[PDB]
Design a protein around this nucleic acid. Structure first.
Ligand SMILES: Nc1c(C(=O)NCc2ccc(F)cc2F)c(=O)n(O)c2ncc(CCS(=O)(=O)c3ccccc3)cc12
Ligand SMILES: Nc1c(C(=O)NCc2ccc(F)cc2F)c(=O)n(O)c2ncc(CCS(=O)(=O)c3ccccc3)cc12
Ligand SMILES: [Mg+2]
Ligand SMILES: [Mg+2]
Ligand SMILES: [Mg+2]
Ligand SMILES: [Mg+2]
Ligand SMILES: [Zn+2]
Ligand SMILES: [Zn+2]
Ligand SMILES: [Zn+2]
Ligand SMILES: [Zn+2]
Lengths: 48, 262, 65, 240, 262, 48, 240, 65
DNA sequence: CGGGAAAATCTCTAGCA
DNA sequence: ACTGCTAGAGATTTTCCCG
DNA sequence: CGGGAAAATCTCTAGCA
DNA sequence: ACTGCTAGAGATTTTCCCG
């Protein structure tokens, strides 16, 4: 299980932690508060 | 240093120290101070220092609307070659974007189109034109123009060339098509010392020729490979290595380790 | 068959790895699939994704080859 | 070493330099000189432009006469301004060198002449059969679109990529891509020939042979209208 | 290829080709096509791909006004150490900037102040406070914030720390001073694994101690050096090299090449 | 003598050529139309 | 090897570890253990706060009691809110550990107590002579400024960097920089001692000596209250 | 004198060159002027400008030295 | 000398209006 | 005649710790 | 093999809203 | 389940050209 802290949409505030559903080369698919979001890996930090 | 963990935690809840400050002040090892930082939700404020890599296939195109002199220019780039097609459009609607995209798909083999989440590209009109022409629609992650980093870069270059030929034409559409000419045929450099038009002709001719050559190779070279196991499709028999494909996995094998039957 | 193999090995491939943003040089094409491309760069057989490769036949082949 | 076999197969078969540079692993300048010294043997940029009329609208159609690849636009008026815009778009899209038009008032305009002067297009004064096939496909797909220009672009799509024929069964887009790749190879060979047509080589010291190839360890020259391979240190190349 | 020069020029006046396009199309050598590009005034549109390097002296400070929550924060950084001093000010006038600067010069040895060309810093009031305190005023090149790249970076970091302690305080000035505390003493890392306060104390103590040590060295080590020539001030006699200073030029000399008299 | 083409102040248009008066590490001092300007070397190109 | 000479010069002179670690090129933990084993031998963070009154205005003055470095601000009111703001500014500017105040209503406030709790400042309940000197300099430079707070900051400048004295002739700013650099060295030595006070070394195999230094090829230990240097492979270090 | 020379050589200098943006490591200070700093990095005597140098005495000298 | 492990260093990015 | 930088996040190299 | 010279490659930046 | 890039300007390395 992972914790993802992310930066989402026109907003400098960082949200999280979220559940990492998918980690690809370049972007991640996460789930925060039953909302599935696709975030680039520059705007996301994953902690095991 | 187990008391140092509690004292470093109760000062991280005040000051939000980094790991080196707590490791210096409370004699913690770096893994423990890093775990005190990594458990604070208020301290995860930075992402991974990397970049992704866009799809450089021969069929993918990247489209974007740029603005110049109060007019909208719809630009497309072939990501593999850099070949652009731009047009001054009257409005930034999807009805005018679907015409541009159907026209472009009629000109070149457009297989996939990568846009941002502009209303022009997100509309039902561009969605019907792509279904008719057989184009796959990819959309970038919202408010992340780096996903379209090719076409945005070409946006810059297109405007640059327009700034050199703005006085040779009276209207902006003429200067836009003049800049498309100059980018496609009068600017050389790249992966083969090519212009963008020579590179797109080379890329599409190479894709056709290599697909024909591989379709003629794999119908005659019908072998099977046992390595280490199980049967596998022989892809390439070399002198020091053998490339196979089993369980949908293309894998390279030493020549010592495999043997090819049939 | 062998002439077609040496024909398909005349194409050059410019590829990239997953966390290196710069394009590696003209590798020799060995095999082309719908999603993968087997190349030979620096006497090393590599498997590139199809999305990470630009396969050309450099038409300055009128000098070398 | 394979120059000799290529010369014998050319005096037997009169092969092109494409065949000799591929069946014998020769540089194309050497096989080009083999086919050029033979006395027995001594178009991709041409487009054709017309205006058709359908439903009261005017359609500019350009046909690549070597491949049949069409490019058609519904224009708002049969004016030299719209024709010059179409020609500038086409010249920026494809390597256009010559257009063949029908002495119309919109084709002999000064605006089209300036557009052809800027893009470097010769203007001279197949096409009707292509307009007939394009009108057939427009009549086929008129029910699928609300406006006419959408149907025209749909028919251009179907003609260029969905209709196949000829000898190999290729579409017009594959044919124009192969034809223009062949033209790029032709222009690159002419550039490679013009780069070394100003050199003169003194070898073995016999006379000024002409250079055909300068490789990693050997040069290839032609003296007395016959071709020989000389080592690199046994030759002196003078640009004259 | 002398006719190619004229034809490449008369097509560069139309298309503005780069040098590789003209060198390919007209068989020019690269120096000639580069000279055709370099003579066109319309083609000089790119600057040098480098960056400068700011003054990292122990006396230089970099000042900037940043904005947060509708309030103005005047920030100063010690460029050599990263030590910051910020304050929420009522207005962005020069009367309020000169008070901050005179206060800062009273706290620390401020020798030079590097600002942008904001009216606050460009005023006659800050110019009189700097004349009184003995501070030299440097201004960056206008509309180039990279010249102030230290303090702007610290601006970012300051706001970052305020975002972590905004709920620990009621007013913004308290959170600003809390963030100044956290940056100066609770964030370690850098050139010595230091915090910013430890680094500024080390830098200023090092400057004092090294000035005293060199003033005691050069009054006793009064030698002259003849190398290769002429007399020169001996700066450092090493085993394999000798560092001298003649004609206001500090120069390193091999030990084989010089000899020291007096 | 040198020609300097530069980018000056809130303006993406490039001006020049100007006379190079001083070339330092990081910036240049130039003279265009009897106006002396200090331009960073990222926003200037010098041709001999 | 120089540990022995340092022990003889300490039993002769009772030198500090600063002198022994510099006159003999010793690590400071070794000279600190030499001066700590001697039974004969067995403040930089203190500030002092006050409020003065001048021209109807109130001035918060903080004095570093080890150096005389002052820091004064005209505050709008003698309120614990302004005092807590001053203390938070001072704690963010300098390493403040203890303030000494005079049982005022603005110093024993809950706001100042929370500000001292956040910054980690002990609050306990020189300064008047410093206020007298600061008032003398304010009266000297009152003619140079329009407002009083400008004159107060000018006097803080003149006191900290233009008035010299003491034994070496240094200003108060140089003195506080040297004092706080000495405190940083003291805290770094205490961190270095606490990092190796949990180790036990078994050498030559004799008993659990305590580690003083672990170098590139040798360790330095103390067994039976005397110090010896042992090679690296002839010692085993166990964290206990 | 020689003890003062070895004293001034205990200070570390972090410097930069004119077109390299990264800070080079702890060189040994040899001489300090008002505008130039003579150092010894990588057994090479270098002359740095005063504006391109940060001279400290790293107070983790309580271990090494 | 040889593997793990941990520390050190290198690479790279956002945000600073 | 003036000038991008800073701190964190991973990745890779380098040093240490005992056999 | 050895110097110059020229070509090739590496590094790095603005602007793309 | 998706993703920075592109072309030019200097700097540095690498290959060529004859002795
Ligand atoms: N633009 C300003 C930035 C800024 O852009 N930061 C983002 C940024 C981007 C890149 C980078 F590397 C660092 C970086 F911070 C800034 O940080 N500050 O503090 C400013 N302070 C004042 C003025 C207006 C000057 S003026 O209009 O008063 C004038 C100019 C010339 C002459 C006269 C008057 C502008 C700015
Ligand atoms: N910002 C846009 C840029 C841009 O910033 N370029 C500068 C830039 C910076 C960095 C970089 F790497 C490249 C780069 F080009 C852009 O180029 N384009 O073409 C845009 N097209 C359209 C929209 C609005 C999307 S939406 O509001 O309609 C929406 C979003 C999500 C869901 C629904 C609707 C914004 C942009
Ligand atoms: Mg867009
Ligand atoms: Mg865009
Ligand atoms: Mg500013
Ligand atoms: Mg700023
Ligand atoms: Zn935290
Ligand atoms: Zn023939
Ligand atoms: Zn030009
Ligand atoms: Zn004692």
């Amino acid at each position: 299980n992972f914790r993802v802290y992310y930066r989402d949409s026109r907003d400098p505030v960082w949200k999280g932690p979220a559940k990492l559903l998918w980690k690809g080369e370049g972007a991640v698919v996460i789930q925060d508060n039953s909302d599935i979001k696709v975030v680039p890996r520059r705007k996301a930090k994953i902690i095991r | 240093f187990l008391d140092g963990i509690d004292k470093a935690q109760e000062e991280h809840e005040k000051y939000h120290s980094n790991w080196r400050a707590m490791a210096s002040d409370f004699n913690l090892p770096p893994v423990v101070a890093k775990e005190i930082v990594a458990s604070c939700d208020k301290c995860q404020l930075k992402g991974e220092a990397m970049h992704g890599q866009v799809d450089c296939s021969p069929g993918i195109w990247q489209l974007d609307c740029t603005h110049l002199e109060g007019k909208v220019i719809l630009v497309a780039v072939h990501v593999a070659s850099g070949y652009i097609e731009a047009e001054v459009i009257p409005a930034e609607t999807g009805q005018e974007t679907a015409y541009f995209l159907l026209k472009l798909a009629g000109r070149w083999p457009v297989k996939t189109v990568h846009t941002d989440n502009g209303s022009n590209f997100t509309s039902t009109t561009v969605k019907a034109a792509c279904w008719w022409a057989g184009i796959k629609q990819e959309f970038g992650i919202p408010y992340n123009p780096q996903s379209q980093g090719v076409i945005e870069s070409m946006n810059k270059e297109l405007k640059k060339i327009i700034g050199q030929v703005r006085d040779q034409a009276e209207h902006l559409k003429t200067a836009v098509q003049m800049a498309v000419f100059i980018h496609n045929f009068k600017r050389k450099g790249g992966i083969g010392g090519y212009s963008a038009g020579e590179r797109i002709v080379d890329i599409i001719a190479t894709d056709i020729q290599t697909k024909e050559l591989q379709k003629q190779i794999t119908k005659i070279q019908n072998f099977r490979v046992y390595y280490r196991k199980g049967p596998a499709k022989l892809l390439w028999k070399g002198e020091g290595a053998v490339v196979i494909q089993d369980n949908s996995d293309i894998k390279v094998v030493p020549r010592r380790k495999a043997k090819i039957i049939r | 068959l062998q002439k077609q193999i040496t024909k398909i090995q005349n194409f050059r491939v410019y590829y990239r790895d997953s966390r290196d943003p710069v394009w590696k040089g003209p590798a020799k094409l060995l095999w082309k699939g719908e999603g993968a491309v087997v190349i030979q760069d620096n006497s090393d057989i590599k498997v590139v994704p199809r999305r990470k490769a630009k396969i050309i036949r450099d038409y300055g082949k009128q000098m070398a080859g």
